[PDB]
């Protein structure tokens, strides 16, 4: 009886499962690795740290490889609960990676916002907001240290660790640009908060110290790294209307084998606002009360999952004038594309089309070479922004092809592309194999 | 000092870890794959789409392989907040997969509900409810597009992609059956909502386009796929009592190497109701107020994690009259079996017994061949449904072997089995290797 | 058009991705394993089960290997909602694993609490609280069965399953120690609850039944298992102050290659209290009301994510008098170290420093050999516990280096270390390869 009687229940169908076993689940032989050690070492910041300033850092040569890089900020909030929305993330307006004077990659705060909405999830996502925002209903004058982790190719997997020991003739530098106005920190809407303190910044880099043999190999052999890059040519001007369904054809200007496309429609006035403001809880300032105004967001709750507040009705991509795929609704790129390829949840207003089976995986799993496409176009169709945004009965009970009239402020269309490239390192210098 | 001093801290115990390294963590060599392309293409639906109708789809031969399949619905809700519970999931009452006139697999909406409770988790689970339900407190007349993803063997992993190019003489068809009455959409309890609109449906299939060489291999060589199937012989009649602890012996009728058994006790009146209704928040209509009634659920909050509202007291499986394992409580199959083999959280009323180490993994990891077992029996023992369901003090403060008196409505016992089978494809035709 | 036109978009950059494919994503060849069967079998408990008693279990020789071990408790709560905090976890005060009279590992309830805060996440974490606590607002007299899963080396992965068949001359035993006082079960603060019932306990072990060939191999060949151990030498006395920033140097006493260090500052009066109590919602009894008292916690909500209530200001580790790394804030070890190496969220008051790239992975990925370090020291600096804990305006709006004055009760410093060791099994006996 018990488990022993199940072993005897053996048939001809068990041949495909346990005939001539190849593996066993009860004796794992673990692999031996190269000895190493990790150390986070602070960097020297060049320039005056402050709102709207540009500072830079030259990675000091302390170890052999570098992996994680974290930017620490110390901020004091100037409003009460729910008056900030990822202020430390917005403060890092853009960051540029440079090797030997050559730009390797460059990221922007809106990419950080888009990456978080698509590729982070669950408790990891909430821990990221602890690191970049106040999440415990803090009041005016609350001071907190923030940690903004960079997400370049060598920051996301140790298998792509940048070998400083193999770059003795090339300097690795980071160029930071700080935001000028950060909601709930030094500005409240358009009005500056008097006495707002300037931020304090520090850059920390995680170094890998290698053993003698592997140290000789990294310094003497040629290296080829399959890296990822971000492409972003600037915001596009979206033209959603309140009386009809407007349409647009945005000529894409991407290159290289691309893993996926990600885009959003943002109101440039408010950071991370990808949906329309409405008089429903969490969608505007003072929603549900007599102080409600659809002009100002509920800053702490800027994001939403309500598709009714998104602006995109349908979309398709055209490749040299012909449809790459049939037109799908905006909710398809927000719900189904992430469901099929990511496995998390994406707030409304952020859209994805993946050419890869696993876009969040470092291992390539399907790409499209935009360098061989003369004309790639994103054909868009917007909803009719005809719903009264101040009426909860109108917002919570309408049809599929309409949205709130406040959606006309979503005029900044940001389109991102993640591509692959090859970083060759030899003779103490590194350079990208493909420039377009 | 720092990391370099840790490298010198090297001893005899490091032999098992870093002696003669076999791998390294700082130089991943990514694998090269076969070139391909993906495209979601809409299908033609045969039949009249409507409540209680049967429609079918013949997969058009656009590409070489097919992977994901999504069913789109457009529904208009007829109630206010919390009056629907996965209506798009319930609308897809059953779906049958057919190759060359032969049924490969067939799923049911209650399986979709059971699969979601056991094998989805975290934000992925919440995104699935966005795709199949209203989750933003929408009101009467709210229209929304829903996406129901199918979970057949070729829908869950690209490694089992169905080769249409290798099936030139066999037709692949899907047979859908739409539910007649959907709570909060066209019915409110037992009463039909006047003017309810019929649903609109579309079927979308993701095709894989292969390169020349791999296209020749799929069309010329014989293929063998290790696939998974669902077994379900219909609901069993549970007989829980309010005066004593009833017991039952359900003769199982499964075959093939089975990964796991999953079952629930459902009140057939309400979709997804696996637990008893009670006058505690979320467990009945208007709970905690003067309008409370334990006759009607809080439809939007039909599920629960409260074990006190589950009906099963203990259970064991018998194999040819002898115990396959010792009797365990119902909470063991709801909490511990999922904890040990899945790693999520399962609402009360859904139970699991796994023969596999990783039941959610495609790779077989332990099965039981039910084709070699003459008598397999699920021995059940129910709690005494003696608690007053209208008393919060009685429901929130009782013992282990009792439940609410409303648990006597959980009379539909659905037992599911997930088994493996082999799909052989050769000479343009496909067929299963094992029929029993 | 469509997907076929993307295949033709092929360039010279595709050489690194799809030239001479090595793998394919659309034809997975699954591996065949050794036939086995699993069965959970109840053990005999030696001794009188009760609060503050020591009981033991000798693993009966029913199967060939053992994997999961679960301890079942049945408890009756003596308070209302929010008056318990993981009572079943605290009840298992310590558990010791013994093979042939030799201790292999020993765990404590505070380690269970620390492990849960660091290495569990998402729905898995919530399911663990369902198994060890009341989570549905149960009232006085509510009875519930609890399941405490052990987390020894053979409990966390089947690849380290303990071979009882290879230990015919060595006895495997578990030594349990039950807590004396459990909040909300038999005590309310310092006052005993009259009529509190003694707990009932049962131990269940999952056995693996192997096929004939693999059974002969396990019983005849020598085995070497790379296992993990917990190190804990007892609580350290922390000395945080309310008038200045105190500092300490705790001489660590660890050995063997260590994966990570984890520590917390606990008020020994309250289980799992790692942060200061304050008059903000969830941080003290009756917070926000006229019955608020910062002397008693909100037991059901003892944990918090508010860094302002943590006590540690900065920390660094010294190796033979020299800095292993530069000083970082306490929030770095609570937010960034888990973000970089775990990927979940860790409540405030629990800190981590990882020597491994993946500390939660069984496969070694970086260690530090503490057996070769003469002096390892944890240098600590505490915040100034000068904030009025009864003032929400003072707690929700202060600076980085201060905390509530109630933080002076966090006087128990628990430092944990997870190391590797080798378990050799030969001639029917097992023994560890390294003792220090
Ligand atoms: C995003 O979503 C989150 C999750 O839903 C929201 O948090 C929830 O808010 C609702 C709560 O029931 C729930 O507990 C909470 O989780 C979040 O809401 C915003 O942030 C929260 C923290 C609230 O802000 C706090 O609100 C109270 C303020 O305190 C003052 O309150 C007065 C009533 C007192 O008279 C005064 O003395 C202050 O309180 C004292 O100090 C506080 C800190 C102590 O807690 C309190 O003792 C209990 C007193 O100590 C003696 C805080 O300054 C502020 O940080 C939301 O505020 C809404 O909900 C409150 C429960 C309510 O009291 C608020 O009304 C006050 O403020 C509004 C204007 O905001 C005034 O018109 C009103 O007269 C009153 O003064 C208010 O309804 C926050 O939400 C508001 O502000 C947002 C800013 O972007 C946004 O505009 C939003 O729509 C607003 O609702 C969400 O952002
Ligand atoms: C599942 O769990 C969820 C999470 O807990 C629940 O959501 C929460 O509900 C409690 C809220 O505090 C919390 O914010 C929310 O997240 C969910 O509850 C059900 O769905 C929610 C959305 C509520 O439904 C909304 O309730 C308000 C209704 O509006 C009417 O309210 C009247 C009081 C007004 O007079 C009338 O004008 C309407 O409001 C106006 O329109 C709305 C849309 C605007 O928001 C409002 O402005 C603020 C007004 O605009 C001018 C909505 O139609 C409805 O969708 C739950 O309803 C309960 O909680 C409400 C806060 C409360 O107001 C409700 O009372 C009303 O309805 C009950 C009957 O339902 C009447 O007896 C009462 O007189 C009053 O009219 C109610 O207590 C939903 O829960 C209820 O219905 C469920 C149906 O299955 C179920 O029966 C449940 O037990 C009920 O409680 C959970 O389903
Ligand atoms: C679900 O859970 C909720 C808690 O989370 C419950 O609410 C709690 O109920 C207990 C209260 O102590 C607590 O405050 C409350 O939160 C809920 O219980 C049911 O609903 C509550 C609100 C009670 O209903 C009220 O009961 C009184 C009725 O009024 C009549 O009372 C008579 C004594 C008078 O003689 C008669 O004139 C009526 O009063 C008049 O009209 C009302 C509307 C006015 O408010 C009142 O003036 C103040 C009078 O005006 C002249 C109300 O209509 C009704 O809403 C529960 O009722 C139980 O508890 C009451 C305290 C008690 O009085 C009730 O006895 C009455 O009703 C029973 C029949 O139920 C009669 O046989 C009896 O003669 C008497 O008339 C009763 O013990 C409700 O619970 C009952 O009904 C449930 C189904 O609806 C269920 O069947 C339950 O087991 C019953 O106990 C929970 O449902
Ligand atoms: C941890 O975080 C959780 C998530 O926030 C908290 O749960 C939330 O609490 C706030 C709710 O709005 C929310 O719905 C809930 O999720 C949790 O809070 C603690 O646990 C919860 C479940 C509450 O305990 C319940 O509180 C109600 C008690 O019932 C009695 O209430 C009286 C008002 C009635 O007069 C009496 O008849 C009782 O109710 C009856 O029986 C109950 C079970 C029925 O539900 C009710 O019908 C609706 C009646 O049936 C006829 C329960 O015994 C108790 O388990 C929190 O309690 C706070 O919030 C309640 C909403 C409020 O009513 C409570 O006030 C009562 O108790 C306080 C003292 O606790 C008294 O001073 C007051 O006079 C009143 O009697 C209370 O404000 C729990 O929180 C409290 O206790 C904790 C113990 O550690 C802790 O001390 C905390 O700070 C306290 O707030 C969090 O622990
Ligand atoms: C989508 O957005 C649009 C634009 O914001 C919105 O239209 C606005 O509605 C308010 C009205 O003052 C504006 O002129 C109009 O632009 C639309 O609301 C829904 O459709 C509109 C056209 C109205 O419907 C018309 O109502 C009158 C009725 O005779 C006619 O048959 C119908 O087409 C909205 O009705 C609301 O506003 C009316 C002015 C008011 O008279 C209605 O009350 C009647 O009906 C309600 C139930 O719907 C009864 O309870 C009440 O006793 C009375 O008979 C009503 O308040 C309509 O909104 C309503 O219906 C939709 C579903 O179609 C949703 O449930 C809304 O939540 C609900 O308010 C938005 O759908
Ligand atoms: C489980 O479900 C059953 C069936 O629903 C339920 O039993 C019902 O209780 C209500 C009663 O009217 C019904 O006849 C009965 O079927 C049971 O409730 C708990 O057990 C029952 C038997 C009652 O206990 C008996 O109470 C009277 C007491 O003299 C005797 O020693 C005891 O065995 C429930 O007590 C509640 O209902 C009584 C009618 C009432 O008198 C009680 O009040 C007394 O006790 C409370 C504290 O318990 C005091 O605050 C109060 O001043 C007075 O002294 C009480 O309301 C009993 O419920 C109570 O106790 C359990 C734990 O045993 C839980 O805490 C409940 O939440 C609590 O109400 C359910 O457990
Ligand atoms: C951190 O913790 C410490 C110790 O708990 C706390 O200091 C306590 O504050 C209360 C006071 O009674 C105690 O003596 C003191 O130990 C500190 O609070 C913040 O700093 C202290 C020093 C006070 O600031 C001083 O306030 C008076 C002002 O003239 C002077 O310039 C300033 O340095 C706290 O101010 C609060 O308490 C005062 C007694 C009261 O007068 C203040 O009211 C004035 O200011 C508020 C706005 O801040 C106006 O709305 C009001 O009309 C009046 O002008 C105030 O209540 C100070 O707390 C306040 O400011 C901080 C940011 O610096 C946070 O926003 C607080 O939430 C807010 O209350 C803690 O930061
Ligand atoms: C959207 O619909 C709202 C309700 O009718 C309008 O208030 C809003 O108008 C805008 O904001 C108001 C307050 C005014 O400033 C208008 O000039 C402005 O156009 C609509 O956008
Ligand atoms: C469960 O216990 C409840 C409280 O005593 C009963 O109301 C309920 O009875 C059912 O529902 C009521 C409203 C009536 O319709 C009865 O005929 C029915 O049996 C119990 O099931
Ligand atoms: Hg393309
Ligand atoms: Hg079996
Ligand atoms: Hg060390």
Residue identifier of the C-alpha nearest atom 2 of ligand 6: B387
Residue identifier of the C-alpha nearest atom 55 of ligand 7: C393
β-bridge partners, A379: A249, A316
Residues in chain B: 436
β-bridge partners, C8: none
Per-residue tokens: C49: 């089960």
Q: Which residue has the tokens 């001893």?
A: B11
Contact B247, B260 (CB under 8 A): no
Contact C21, B32 (CB under 8 A): yes
Per-residue tokens: A28: 């794992």
CA distance C419 to C436: 11
Nearest-5° Cα angle at B127, B122 to B130: 135
| DSSP labels, C317-385 | EEETTEESS--EEHHIIIIIHHHHHT-S---TTEEEEESSS-TTSSS----EEGGG-S-EEEEEEE-EE
Do C43 and C149 sit in the same domain of this protein? yes
Residue where a domain terminates, one of A176, A205, A221: A221
Domain-embedded: residue B12? no
CA distance C3 to C1: 7
* Phi, psi (rounded to 5 degrees) for C29: -100, 105
Per-residue DSSP letter, B143: E
Q: Are strands C65-76 and C92-99 parallel, antiparallel or unpaired?
A: unpaired
- Burial degree of A133 (CB within 10 A; 0-12, 13-18, 19+): buried
The answer, for B48 touching chain A at a CB cutoff of 8 Å, is no
C-interface mutation test, from B68, B345, B353, most C Cβ less than 10 A away: B345
CA distance B42 to A328: 10
Given in angstroms, what resolution was this structure solved at? 2.0
At B112, which CATH number?
2.70.9.10
Name the nearest CA neighbour of C308 among B397, A434, B435, A77: A77
Do A232 and A363 sit in the same domain of this protein? yes
- Using a 6 Å cutoff on CB, does residue C398 contact ligand 7? yes
Treating both helix axes as pointing N-terminal to C-terminal, what angle do A122-132 and B122-132 enclose, rounded to 10 degrees?
A: 100
- Which residues have CB under 8 Å from A271's CB, separation 6+? A85, A86, A90, A109, A113, A182, A183, A302
SS3 labels along chain A: CCHHHHHHCCCHHHHHHHCCCCCCCCCCCCCCCCCEEEEEEECCEECCCCCCCEEEEECCCCCCEEEEEEEEEEEECCCCCCCCCCHHHHHEEEEEEEECCEEEEEEEHHHHHHHHHHHCCHHHHHHHHHHHCCCCCCCCCCEEEEEEECCCHHHHCHHHCEEHHHCCCCCEEEEEEECCCCECCCEECCEECCCCCCCEEEEEEEEEEECHHHHHHHHHCCEEEEEEEEECCCCEECCCCCCCCCEEEEECCCCCEEEEEEEEEECCCCCCCCCCCCCCCCCCECCCCCCCECCCCCHHHCCCCCHHHCCEEEEEEEECCEECCCCEEHHHHHHHHHHHHCCCCCCCCEEEEECCCCCCCCCCCCCEEHHHCCCEEEEEEECEEEECCCCHHHHCCCCCCEEEHHHHHCCEEEEEEEEEEEEEEECCEEEECCCC
Q: Which residue has the tokens 């075959």?
A: B255
The answer, for C226 touching chain B at a CB cutoff of 8 Å, is yes
Domains held by chain C: number: 2
Treating both helix axes as pointing N-terminal to C-terminal, what angle do B122-132 and C122-132 enclose, rounded to 10 degrees?
A: 100
Q: Which residue has the tokens 């045969």?
A: B46
Which of B42, B131, B139 is facing A396, going by the closest CB pair?
B139
Nearest-5° Cα angle at C180, C174 to C183: 115
Domain-embedded: residue B6? no
Q: Are strands A429-432 and A187-188 parallel, antiparallel or unpaired?
A: unpaired
- The H or E element spanning position C45 is strand C45-46
Structural gaps in chain C: residues followed by a C–N separation over 2.5 Å? none
Domain-embedded: residue C61? yes
Contact A378, A252 (CB under 8 A): yes
Domain-embedded: residue C10? no
Q: In terms of C-beta distances under 8 Å and separation of at least 24 residues, what long-range contacts does A360-365 make, across chains too?
A: A360/A119, A362/A156, A362/A157, A362/A159, A362/A160, A362/A228, A362/B28, A362/B30, A363/B30, A363/B31, A364/A226, A364/A257, A364/A259, A364/A420, A364/B30, A364/B33, A364/C17, A365/B33, A365/C25
Q: Is the dihedral of CA C230, C235, C240, C245 positive or negative?
A: negative
- The H or E element spanning position C92 is strand C92-99
- Using a 6 Å cutoff on CB, does residue C397 contact ligand 7? yes
Do A207 and A239 sit in the same domain of this protein? no
Do A174 and A272 sit in the same domain of this protein? no
**Helix, strand, coil shares, percent, chain C, to 5:** 20, 35, 45
In this structure, the number of other CB atoms found within 10 A of the CB of residue C234 comes to 10
Do A121 and A270 sit in the same domain of this protein? no
Domain-embedded: residue C54? yes
Q: Which residue has the tokens 């709930």?
A: A184
- The H or E element spanning position B312 is strand B312-319
CA distance B190 to A71: 60
Residue where a domain terminates, one of B221, B244, B266: B221
CA distance A171 to A61: 9
CA B38 centroid distance within chain: 26
Do A300 and A369 sit in the same domain of this protein? yes
CA distance C432 to C104: 7
CA distance A175 to A57: 7
- Using a 6 Å cutoff on CB, does residue A285 contact ligand 1? yes
The answer, for C136 touching chain B at a CB cutoff of 8 Å, is yes
In this structure, the number of other CB atoms found within 10 A of the CB of residue A110 comes to 23
- Using a 6 Å cutoff on CB, does residue B47 contact ligand 2? no
CA distance B98 to B107: 12
Name the nearest CA neighbour of B73 among B53, B86, B88: B88
CA distance A164 to A429: 10
| DSSP labels, B299-311 | GGG-----GGG--
CA distance C78 to C82: 11
Residues measured by CB to lie within 5 Å of ligand 12, the ion: C 368
Residue where a domain terminates, one of B204, B221, B238: B221
On the CB side of C212, CA atoms within 13 Å amount to: 1
To test the ligand 6 pocket, which listed residue (B397, B399, B403) has its Cβ within 8 A of the most ligand atoms? B397
Domain of A303, in residue numbers: 222-436
β-bridge partners, B202: B72
* Phi, psi (rounded to 5 degrees) for B166: -95, 10
Cβ contacts of A120 on chain C, cutoff 8 Å: none
Question: Could you say which residues from 383 to 402 on chain C have a Cβ atom under 8 Å away from some Cβ of chain A?
Answer: 393, 396-400
Name the nearest CA neighbour of B43 among B66, B56, B59, B24: B59
Do C230 and C353 sit in the same domain of this protein? yes
Which of A35, A214, A364 is facing B30, going by the closest CB pair?
A364
At B290, which CATH number?
2.70.9.20
Per-residue tokens: B428: 């343009």
Nearest-5° Cα angle at B187, B185 to B188: 100
β-bridge partners, B147: B72
Per-residue tokens: B244: 């004593």
Burial B97-125 (b: 16+ CB within 10 A, else e): bbbeeeebbbbbbbbbbbbbbbbbbbbbb
- Nearest Cα of chain B lies from the Cα of A107 at a distance, in angstroms, of 24
Domain-embedded: residue B5? no
Burial A18-57 (b: 16+ CB within 10 A, else e): beebeebbbbbebebbbbbbbbbbebebeeeeebebebbb
Three-state DSSP class for residue B131 = helix
In this structure, the number of other CB atoms found within 10 A of the CB of residue A330 comes to 26
Contact B404, B277 (CB under 8 A): yes
CA distance B385 to A330: 48
Q: Which chain A residue's Cα is nearest to C217?
A: A27
Do A215 and A230 sit in the same domain of this protein? no
Do B211 and B330 sit in the same domain of this protein? no
Do B132 and B39 sit in the same domain of this protein? yes
Do C383 and C251 sit in the same domain of this protein? yes
Q: Are strands C312-319 and C376-382 parallel, antiparallel or unpaired?
A: antiparallel
Do A162 and A230 sit in the same domain of this protein? no
- Burial degree of C20 (CB within 10 A; 0-12, 13-18, 19+): exposed
Instruction: Write out the E strands in B16-122.
Output: 36-42, 45-46, 54-58, 65-76, 92-99, 102-108
Which of B7, B206, B368 is facing A209, going by the closest CB pair?
B7
Domain-embedded: residue C29? no
Interchain CB distance below 8 Å, C142 and B397? yes
Domain-embedded: residue B334? yes
| DSSP labels, C219-254 | HHS-EEEEEEEEE----EE----SSS--EEEEE---
Q: Are strands C312-319 and C322-323 parallel, antiparallel or unpaired?
A: antiparallel
CA C405 centroid distance within chain: 28
Per-residue tokens: A128: 């990221």
CA distance A109 to A97: 15
On the CB side of B115, CA atoms within 13 Å amount to: 18
Q: Phi/psi zone of residue A362: left (φ > 0), alpha (ψ -120 to 50 degrees), beta?
A: alpha
Per-residue tokens: B371: 């084709």
* Phi, psi (rounded to 5 degrees) for C401: -95, 15
């Amino acid at each position: 009886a018990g488990g022993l009687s199940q072993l005897v229940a053996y048939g001809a169908q068990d041949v495909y499962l346990t005939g001539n076993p190849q593996i066993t689940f009860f004796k794992t032989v673990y692999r031996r690795y190269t000895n190493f050690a990790i150390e986070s070492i602070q960097q020297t910041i060049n320039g005056s740290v402050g709102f709207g300033n540009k500072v830079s850092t030259q990675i000091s040569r302390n170890g052999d490889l570098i992996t994680d890089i974290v930017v620490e900020f110390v901020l004091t909030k100037g409003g009460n609960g729910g008056t900030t929305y990822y202020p430390a993330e917005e403060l890092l307006q853009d960051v540029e990676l440079e090797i030997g004077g050559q730009r390797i990659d460059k990221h922007y705060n809106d990419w950080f916002r888009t990456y978080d909405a698509l590729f982070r999830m669950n408790d990891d996502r909430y821990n990221y907001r602890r690191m970049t925002d106040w999440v415990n209903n803090e009041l005016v004058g609350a001071q907190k240290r923030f940690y903004v982790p960079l997400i370049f190719f060598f920051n996301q997997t140790p298998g792509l660790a940048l070998p400083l020991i193999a770059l003795q003739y090339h300097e690795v530098k980071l160029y930071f640009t700080l935001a000028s106005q950060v909601q709930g920190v030094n500005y409240n809407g358009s009005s500056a908060i008097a006495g707002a303190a300037q931020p304090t910044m520090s850059v920390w880099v995680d170094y890998i110290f290698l053993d003698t043999q592997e140290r000789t190999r990294f310094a003497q052999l040629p290296h080829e790294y399959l890296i990822e890059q971000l492409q972003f040519t600037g915001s596009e001007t979206a033209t959603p209307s309140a009386t009809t369904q407007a349409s647009q054809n945005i000529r894409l200007n991407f290159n290289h084998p691309t893993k996926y496309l990600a885009w959003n429609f943002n109101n440039p006035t408010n950071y991370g606002q990808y949906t329309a403001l409405a008089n429903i809880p969490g969608a505007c300032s003072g929603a549900g009360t007599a102080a409600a105004t659809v002009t100002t967001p509920d800053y702490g709750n800027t994001g939403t999952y309500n598709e009714q507040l998104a602006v995109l009705d349908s979309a398709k991509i055209q490749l040299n004038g012909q449809d790459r795929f049939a037109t799908r609704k905006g909710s398809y790129f927000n719900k189904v594309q992430p469901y099929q390829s990511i496995g998390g949840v994406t707030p409304a207003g952020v859209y994805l089309y993946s050419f890869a089976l696993k876009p969040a995986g470092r291992q390539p799993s399907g790409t499209c070479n935009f360098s061989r496409i003369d004309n790639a176009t994103l054909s868009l169709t917007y909803k009719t922004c005809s719903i009264d945004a101040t009426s909860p009965a109108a917002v919570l009970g309408n049809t599929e092809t309409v949205t709130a009239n406040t959606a006309t402020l979503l005029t900044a269309l940001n389109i991102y592309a993640k591509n692959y490239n090859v970083l060759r390192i030899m003779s103490g210098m590194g350079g990208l194999a493909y420039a377009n």
